[PDB]
Amino acid sequence: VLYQGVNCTEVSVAIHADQLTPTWRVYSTGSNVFQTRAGCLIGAEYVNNSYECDIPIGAGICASYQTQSQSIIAYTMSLGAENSVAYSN
Amino acid sequence: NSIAIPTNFTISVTTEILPVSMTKTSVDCTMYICGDSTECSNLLLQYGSFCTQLKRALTGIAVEQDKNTQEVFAQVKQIYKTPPIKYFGGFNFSQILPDPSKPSKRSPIEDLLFNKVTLICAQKFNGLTVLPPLLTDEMIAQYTSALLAGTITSGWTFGAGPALQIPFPMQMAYRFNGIGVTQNVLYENQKLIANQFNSAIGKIQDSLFSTPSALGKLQDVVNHNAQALNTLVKQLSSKFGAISSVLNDILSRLDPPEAEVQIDRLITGRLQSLQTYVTQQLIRAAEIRASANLAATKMSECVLGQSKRVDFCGKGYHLMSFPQSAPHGVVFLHVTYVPAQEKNFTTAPAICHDGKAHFPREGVFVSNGTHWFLTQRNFYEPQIITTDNTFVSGNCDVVIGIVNNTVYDPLQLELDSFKEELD
Amino acid sequence: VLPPLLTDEMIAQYTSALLAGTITSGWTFGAGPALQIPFPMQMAYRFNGIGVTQNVLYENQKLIANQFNSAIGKIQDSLFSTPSALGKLQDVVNHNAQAL
Amino acid sequence: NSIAIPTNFTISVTTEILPVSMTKTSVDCTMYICGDSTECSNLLLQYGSF
Amino acid sequence: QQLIRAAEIRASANLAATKMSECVLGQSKRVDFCGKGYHLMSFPQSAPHG
Amino acid sequence: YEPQIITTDNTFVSGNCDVVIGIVNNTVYDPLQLELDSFKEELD
Ligand SMILES: *[C@@H]1O[C@H](CO)[C@@H](O[C@@H]2O[C@H](CO)[C@@H](O[C@@H]3O[C@H](CO)[C@@H](O)[C@H](O)[C@@H]3O)[C@H](O)[C@H]2NC(C)=O)[C@H](O)[C@H]1NC(C)=O
Ligand SMILES: *[C@@H]1O[C@H](CO)[C@@H](O[C@@H]2O[C@H](CO)[C@@H](O[C@@H]3O[C@H](CO)[C@@H](O)[C@H](O)[C@@H]3O)[C@H](O)[C@H]2NC(C)=O)[C@H](O)[C@H]1NC(C)=O
Ligand SMILES: *[C@@H]1O[C@H](CO)[C@@H](O[C@@H]2O[C@H](CO)[C@@H](O[C@@H]3O[C@H](CO)[C@@H](O)[C@H](O)[C@@H]3O)[C@H](O)[C@H]2NC(C)=O)[C@H](O)[C@H]1NC(C)=O
Ligand SMILES: *[C@@H]1O[C@H](CO)[C@@H](O[C@@H]2O[C@H](CO)[C@@H](O)[C@H](O)[C@H]2NC(C)=O)[C@H](O)[C@H]1NC(C)=O
Ligand SMILES: *[C@@H]1O[C@H](CO)[C@@H](O[C@@H]2O[C@H](CO)[C@@H](O)[C@H](O)[C@H]2NC(C)=O)[C@H](O)[C@H]1NC(C)=O
Ligand SMILES: *[C@@H]1O[C@H](CO)[C@@H](O[C@@H]2O[C@H](CO)[C@@H](O)[C@H](O)[C@H]2NC(C)=O)[C@H](O)[C@H]1NC(C)=O
Ligand SMILES: *[C@@H]1O[C@H](CO)[C@@H](O)[C@H](O)[C@H]1NC(C)=O
Numbered sequence: 001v002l003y004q005g006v007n008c009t010e011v012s013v014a015i016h017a018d019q020l021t022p023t024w025r026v027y028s029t030g031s032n033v034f035q036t037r038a039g040c041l042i043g044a045e046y047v048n049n050s051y052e053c054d055i056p057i058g059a060g061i062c063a064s065y066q067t068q069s070q071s072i073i074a075y076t077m078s079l080g081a082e083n084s085v086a087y088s089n
Numbered sequence: 090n091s092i093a094i095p096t097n098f099t100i101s102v103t104t105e106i107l108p109v110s111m112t113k114t115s116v117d118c119t120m121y122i123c124g125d126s127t128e129c130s131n132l133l134l135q136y137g138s139f140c141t142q143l144k145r146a147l148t149g150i151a152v153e154q155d156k157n158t159q160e161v162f163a164q165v166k167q168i169y170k171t172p173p174i175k176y177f178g179g180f181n182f183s184q185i186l187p188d189p190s191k192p193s194k195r196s197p198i199e200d201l202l203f204n205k206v207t208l209i210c211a212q213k214f215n216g217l218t219v220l221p222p223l224l225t226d227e228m229i230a231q232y233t234s235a236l237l238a239g240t241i242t243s244g245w246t247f248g249a250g251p252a253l254q255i256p257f258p259m260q261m262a263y264r265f266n267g268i269g270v271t272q273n274v275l276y277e278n279q280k281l282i283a284n285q286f287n288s289a290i291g292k293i294q295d296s297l298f299s300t301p302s303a304l305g306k307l308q309d310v311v312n313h314n315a316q317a318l319n320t321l322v323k324q325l326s327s328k329f330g331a332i333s334s335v336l337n338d339i340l341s342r343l344d345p346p347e348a349e350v351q352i353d354r355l356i357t358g359r360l361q362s363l364q365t366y367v368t369q370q371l372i373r374a375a376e377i378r379a380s381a382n383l384a385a386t387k388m389s390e391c392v393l394g395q396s397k398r399v400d401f402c403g404k405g406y407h408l409m410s411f412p413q414s415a416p417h418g419v420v421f422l423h424v425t426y427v428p429a430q431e432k433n434f435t436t437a438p439a440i441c442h443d444g445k446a447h448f449p450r451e452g453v454f455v456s457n458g459t460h461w462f463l464t465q466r467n468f469y470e471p472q473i474i475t476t477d478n479t480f481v482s483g484n485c486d487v488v489i490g491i492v493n494n495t496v497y498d499p500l501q502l503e504l505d506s507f508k509e510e511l512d
Numbered sequence: 513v514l515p516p517l518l519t520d521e522m523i524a525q526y527t528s529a530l531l532a533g534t535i536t537s538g539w540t541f542g543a544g545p546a547l548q549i550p551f552p553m554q555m556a557y558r559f560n561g562i563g564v565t566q567n568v569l570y571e572n573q574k575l576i577a578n579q580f581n582s583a584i585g586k587i588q589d590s591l592f593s594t595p596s597a598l599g600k601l602q603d604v605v606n607h608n609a610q611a612l
Numbered sequence: 613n614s615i616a617i618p619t620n621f622t623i624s625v626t627t628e629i630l631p632v633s634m635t636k637t638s639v640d641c642t643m644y645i646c647g648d649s650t651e652c653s654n655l656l657l658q659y660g661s662f
Numbered sequence: 663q664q665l666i667r668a669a670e671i672r673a674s675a676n677l678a679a680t681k682m683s684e685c686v687l688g689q690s691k692r693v694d695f696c697g698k699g700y701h702l703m704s705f706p707q708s709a710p711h712g
Numbered sequence: 713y714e715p716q717i718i719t720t721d722n723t724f725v726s727g728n729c730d731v732v733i734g735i736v737n738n739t740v741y742d743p744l745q746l747e748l749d750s751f752k753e754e755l756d
């Protein structure tokens with residue numbers, strides 16, 4: 001889930017205080033809470049590896065279901081492979 | 090019988106600014122109409138799926154805006170990089186290429202464009218939110234850099250197959266042949282052309298920096314979105330015939346029946362305000378889509394190619410274009426060939442030699458008062474009239490306005506140089 | 513109803529300028545300064561553009577001029593005779609009138 | 613192995629008609645809804661900036 | 663309704679301007695863009711609202 | 713890629729050697745002169 005426009009600290013506090021309006025809870029264990037510019041993403045593990053975008057989240061960040069068993073992984077999307085052109089005179 | 094032919098030329102750079110994307114908004118329909126009020130929400134349920142339709146319309150717009158950005162900028166198969174030595178025949182691209190010394194890795198022109206146009210939605214935070222773009226400004230800058238590196242090092246090859254390196258002056262030589270000017274014009278005048286290009290780019294920076302209205306097309310989009318949201322928020326203060334604009338006061342003083350009447354008046358007014366806002370956003374989205382489709386077409390035909398369409402890629406004969414990223418849009422720098430310093434020459438449709446009509450193969454017959462020469466149409470370069478430069482079709486009498494002049498056949502003179510006496 | 517910013521005379525002047533430019537300079541005036549060229553040579557270049565050699569125009573110049581003049585006369589007869597020829601503009605006028 | 617090639621040609625002129633502009637209109641909102649009526653205008657003010 | 667009509671007229675005007683630039687001020691290789699046949703040249707004429 | 717011999721028919725001449733930046737030295741073959749040479753120049 002993505003809580004849009006909110007800090008992960010505010011969401012965590014609202015969870016601990018039993019203030020958040022929806023009554024469902026995501027496990028929200030270690031490494032599954034990641035702060036994006038779009039909002040607080042809970043239930044996805046951020047990886048440094050960049051991959052092509054699958055499910056867009058926002059502000060450059062995408063997520064997909066990957067084998068690492070499998071889980072939902074959040075990542076910064078790749079724009080393409082690099083190709084340095086052998087330019088010369 | 091009078092034709093004017095350029096004896097010089099100017100390399101000109103013009104700027105075209107196009108919107109690509111619109112601010113992506115979302116609305117919590119229930120919070121806007123019936124914020125923190127159960128009674129109002131229950132009355133709102135009797136109007137059917139209006140909030141659902143409004144949500145779908147705004148979601149569709151947001152997705153469309155990401156589609157527009159993706160279609161305009163993500164047109165390159167690979168992220169291309171320039172060589173470590175920024176030497177391209179004497180052409181200076183340092184003002185359009187990314188500057189590695191600054192964060193965001195944008196070019197000087199892109200920084201100017203970003204500075205001229207003006208995360209947490211502290212303002213208008215009444216159930217109205219703004220979603221970030223899917224691609225960040227850095228990602229757009231990377232696509233622009235890849236497109237520039239591709240164009241500079243590979244010309245149009247990378248846009249229709251694999252990227253193939255070519256020296257930049259030869260890329261220009263082919264672009265000159267495209268407009269209809271021979272390669273030797275570029276090579277003999279290569280330094281002049283590079284100097285005119287560099288001057289034109291400096292003028293682009295001075296023009297955009299000096300004139301505050303240069304980017305009005307993008308600022309108008311930002312301002313119209315701001316006005317639409319300021320109006321939508323302002324409408325919450327209207328009473329629409331109710332005793333009060335605040336639902337909490339209506340519920341605080343009145344019993345359910347009267348509160349329901351006053352709330353229905355407010356629900357009707359707020360719902361009309363949201364329906365108007367969404368309709369306006371859909372119309373604006375259609376306009377932005379058309380602009381984004383034009384920008385993508387120009388990206389493909391002006392930057393990844395060379396276009397023969399008049400005024401499509403700027404005024405003059407098109408040579409090449411360079412994209413630059415801008416907030417909510419794209420700026421194209423169009424490099425064109427502009428004829429200059431024309432001279433008036435006498436012309437003729439054909440030359441009569443020995444009863445035969447000679448026509449130019451690739452050029453125009455001109456006369457400098459006393460002598461006839463063949464020149465290319467877009468650049469004065471007189472050449473001797475020969476059997477290689479012209480073709481023969483029909484007799485002399487048929488062409489209207491035909492003139493008498495010698496057509497030189499190199500073969501016969503060469504044969505005459507070889508002794509005909511034999512003994 | 514607000515008047516247009518450009519009057520019908522101003523639009524006619526722009527059209528006349530465009531016709532004078534095209535007729536006397538071909539495409540040169542649209543991408544740089546206007547350069548005069550004799551009209552038959554402008555057509556010769558237009559023929560090369562489509563992929564027909566210049567001698568076809570010059571040998572058949574009178575036929576081409578006659579066909580052009582005939583076609584223009586036919587344009588006037590077609591537009592004058594058929595009341596529906598301009599429906600695309602009349603529909604705009606009618607839709608604005610219906611809306612008001 | 614058969615190709616057809618023109619031996620003659622015709623110069624043709626066709627007509628294309630395109631709209632460019634629409635009648636420019638303006639509306640006095642207050643006069644249309646509440647013409648020459650102060651009481652109606654005062655009620656109209658409660659609907660906000662329509 | 664006027665905004666929707668304005669969008670349609672804008673699209674038409676943009677097409678007319680493109681045709682003015684590519685058909686009248688140039689020569690176009692685009693099939694059927696500047697009429698049927700191989701394009702030679704075009705001439706504009708003013709008309710009410712178009 | 714389709715390599716061909718550099719000839720006076722494949723290329724055109726404009727200006728002298730010195731003006732072009734990066735010009736290289738290579739033979740340009742003129743078929744006419746070789747053909748002429750095949751036709752006996754001795755005459756006797
Ligand atoms: C390609 O062009 C750039 C400029 O367009 C050349 O780099 C240097 O850019 C600065 C821009 O600021 C030029 O002016 C400088 O301005 C500051 C004040 O802003 C002043 O304190 C400096 O003394 C200088 O005047 C600078 O002149 C320019 N360099 C030169 C040699 O003119 C870049 O060198 C060009 N690349 C090549 C390969 O020529
Ligand atoms: C075609 O036009 C170009 C310009 O559009 C001509 O090049 C220009 O030639 C003039 C005179 O030679 C240059 O002016 C000189 O500039 C130097 C700069 O240091 C200055 O010291 C001199 O006192 C004088 O002002 C001008 O800069 C130059 N422009 C460029 C861009 O190089 C060219 O000669 C013309 N060719 C023909 C055949 O007409
Ligand atoms: C190619 O086609 C054109 C027409 O599209 C041919 O020109 C036409 O030739 C005929 C016969 O020579 C002309 O008809 C004659 O017109 C005169 C007018 O005074 C009339 O008195 C005669 O009794 C007869 O009707 C016709 O007008 C003419 N069309 C034009 C526009 O000039 C041309 O000959 C054809 N060429 C070839 C090689 O097939
Ligand atoms: C037209 O051009 C021709 C050749 O381009 C000019 O003739 C040359 O003029 C120069 C003048 O210094 C002489 O040195 C050459 O020997 C001339 N060559 C020939 C073949 O005549 C001619 O003068 C030019 N005329 C005008 C009016 O510009
Ligand atoms: C080009 O030269 C030819 C001759 O080679 C000219 O033809 C002559 O024109 C005169 C005009 O009075 C006639 O009397 C001769 O009988 C013609 N001779 C031939 C062989 O045709 C022709 O007029 C010249 N054209 C121009 C424009 O000067
Ligand atoms: C191409 O060949 C010419 C000679 O035919 C070279 O010109 C000579 O260059 C040397 C360089 O030191 C000079 O000393 C000679 O005086 C030049 N002679 C002439 C007649 O110009 C030219 O440099 C060669 N070019 C290349 C790239 O090798
Ligand atoms: C969230 O709050 C912490 C509090 O220390 C702050 O450091 C962080 O920058 C905040 N992030 C956002 C996105 O608001």
Ligand SMILES: *[C@@H]1O[C@H](CO)[C@@H](O)[C@H](O)[C@H]1NC(C)=O
Nearest residue numbers: 087088089172174176177178
């Ligand atoms: C191209 O030539 C210039 C001449 O100054 C030189 O500095 C540059 O290094 C050359 N490029 C390569 C790739 O050798």
Ligand SMILES: *[C@@H]1O[C@H](CO)[C@@H](O)[C@H](O)[C@H]1NC(C)=O
Nearest residue numbers: 091092093432433434435548
């Ligand atoms: C064109 O050149 C001729 C001389 O060749 C001159 O008489 C005429 O006035 C010139 N026209 C213009 C517009 O420069």
